[PDB]
C-alpha cells in the first residue's frame, strides 16, 4: 500500500480509537468532568458543532476528489470537535444531575492518590542511581533532585488536604506531614547541593542516608492519605437527576456512535469514493450525527435558563 492512503486510514483508525475513548465521559457521569461552568459548556459546545459540521463537509469533498492530505487533516479536525463536544456534554451532563434537589455534588479525594505512587517511585529511582554503578555524576543528581519535586508538591497536597478536610484528627496528620516531607525534603536537598560540589563517595552516602526519612515521610503520608474518609465520594444523583441529565447524555452518545460509522465508512470510500452504498451509509450516519447535535443544543438551552 502507499505510504499516502496508508496515512490517510491510520488518520481514520486513530479518529476512531479517539472517541472509544472519549465516549468514556458519558458512562456514569458522577464528578465533574473539568471546571467548565455550565454556560462554558454551552459556548464550547457551540463553537464545536461548527468546527465539527466544517470538517464532515471536508471529509465527504475530499474523499471523493482524492486529496488524500486533506481528507486526513478534516479528520483530524472532526476528531478534535467530536473530543471537545462531547467534554463539554458530559460535563453539562453532570451540572445538570447533581442540581436536583434530591442529588449530592461529587467530593473529590483529598490527595491525589496517584502522586504518591509517582513520589515512591522516584526515591526507589534515586535509590538505585546512587547505589549501582550504571549512571553519571549528572545523572545522579537528576534522579535525586526529581525525589525533592515530586516532595516539595506532596507539601501543597497536604496543606490542601488539612485546610479543606473537616475532620481535625486528619488535619493534623496533615499539617505535621507537611513539616515531616518538607523538614526530611529539605534535609536531602542539602545532601544533593553537596554532592553535587563534591562527588565523593561519602556524599553519595549521605544523600543515600537523606532518602530515608524522606521516604519513612511520604510512607506516613502516602498511606495514611488513602485510608477512607479520603477517596473521592462519587455524586449521588436521584432519579430525577438522571432523568434530567438524559438527553444530553443519550444525544452525545448517539453523535458519537454515528460520527465513529462516518468515519468507518468515510476511511473506505478514501481508497475508493465510486461506491453508492458506502456514500448512503456515511449519509445516514451523517444525518443522526447532525441531528444528535441539534437535539444536544435544543436540550443544553432548555436548560440553560437555571444557570444564569
Not at 138 to 152: E, F
Not at 157 to 165: G, K, M, P, V
Request: charged share 20%; proline share 6%; net charge neutral.
Amino acid at each position: 500500500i502507499d505510504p499516502f492512503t496508508k496515512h490517510g486510514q491510520k488518520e481514520c483508525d486513530n479518529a476512531l480509537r479517539q472517541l472509544e475513548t472519549v465516549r468514556e465521559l458519558l458512562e456514569n457521569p458522577v464528578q465533574p468532568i473539568n471546571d467548565m461552568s455550565y454556560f462554558g459548556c454551552l459556548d464550547s459546545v457551540m463553537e464545536n458543532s461548527k468546527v465539527l459540521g466544517e470538517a464532515m463537509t471536508g471529509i465527504s469533498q475530499n474523499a471523493k476528489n482524492g486529496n488524500l492530505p486533506e481528507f486526513g487533516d478534516a479528520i483530524a479536525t472532526a476528531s478534535k470537535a467530536l473530543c471537545g463536544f462531547t467534554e463539554a456534554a458530559a460535563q453539562a451532563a453532570y451540572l445538570v444531575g447533581v442540581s436536583d434537589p434530591n442529588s449530592q455534588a461529587g467530593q473529590q479525594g483529598l490527595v491525589e492518590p496517584t502522586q504518591f505512587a509517582r513520589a515512591n517511585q522516584a526515591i526507589q529511582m534515586a535509590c538505585q542511581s546512587l547505589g549501582e554503578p550504571g549512571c553519571t555524576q549528572a545523572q545522579v543528581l537528576s534522579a535525586a533532585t526529581i525525589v525533592a519535586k515530586h516532595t516539595s508538591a506532596l507539601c501543597n497536597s497536604c496543606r490542601l488536604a488539612s485546610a479543606r478536610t473537616a475532620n481535625p484528627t486528619a488535619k493534623r496528620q496533615f499539617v505535621q506531614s507537611a513539616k515531616e516531607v518538607a523538614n526530611s525534603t529539605a534535609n536531602l536537598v542539602k545532601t544533593i547541593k553537596a554532592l553535587d560540589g563534591d562527588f565523593t563517595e561519602e556524599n553519595r552516602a549521605q544523600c543515600r542516608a537523606a532518602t530515608a526519612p524522606l521516604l519513612e515521610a511520604v510512607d506516613n503520608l502516602s498511606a495514611f492519605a488513602s485510608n477512607p474518609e479520603f477517596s473521592s465520594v462519587p455524586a449521588q444523583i436521584s432519579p430525577e437527576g438522571r432523568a434530567a441529565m438524559e438527553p444530553i447524555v443519550i444525544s452525545a452518545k448517539t453523535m458519537l456512535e454515528s460520527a465513529g460509522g462516518l468515519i468507518q465508512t468515510a476511511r473506505a470510500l478514501a481508497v475508493n469514493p465510486r461506491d453508492p452504498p458506502r456514500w448512503s451509509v456515511l449519509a445516514g450516519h451523517s444525518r443522526t450525527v447532525s441531528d444528535s447535535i441539534k437535539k444536544l443544543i435544543t436540550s443544553m438551552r432548555d436548560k440553560a435558563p437555571g444557570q444564569l
